Structure formats: structure tokens, C-alpha cells
Design a binder for this molecule. Sequence first.
Ligand SMILES: [Cl-]
Length: 70
Amino acid sequence: MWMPPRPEEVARKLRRLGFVERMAKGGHRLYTHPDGRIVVVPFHSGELPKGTFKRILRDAGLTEEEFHNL
Ligand SMILES: [Cl-]
């Protein structure tokens, strides 16, 4: 089963990989990693739509596995 992740849990996992928050405005935050990945995450809702979660994984350069273990 598809379990919609919470945006703040996604942000904690990104931060554990070395992404750092560079903008916070309008209920969104933009995170960059030293290797140049750039990821925007919406926080206005408590859970992310599937497509937004899959956009975040794409832009973060992650698989589901790596994601869940952080
Ligand atoms: Cl980990």
C-alpha cells in the first residue's frame, strides 16, 4: 500500500543527506545539496500527494529504499 509521507519527515531525511534549507516562504521550502541537487517541498498540507512525493525523490536523486531508511 501507498503511504503518503509527511512533508516534515521528508525534510528531515533530506537534511540527514546534507541538503540545507535556502528559502522558506509561502508554505514551501527550497533545499539545496552541496552536489547541486535542488528540491522544493510544500508544507501547507500534512501529507504529500503521490506525484509530489515522486517529484521530490526525482529531484533529490533518491530511490524509495534510500528514502525510507533515512
Ligand atoms: Cl540513514
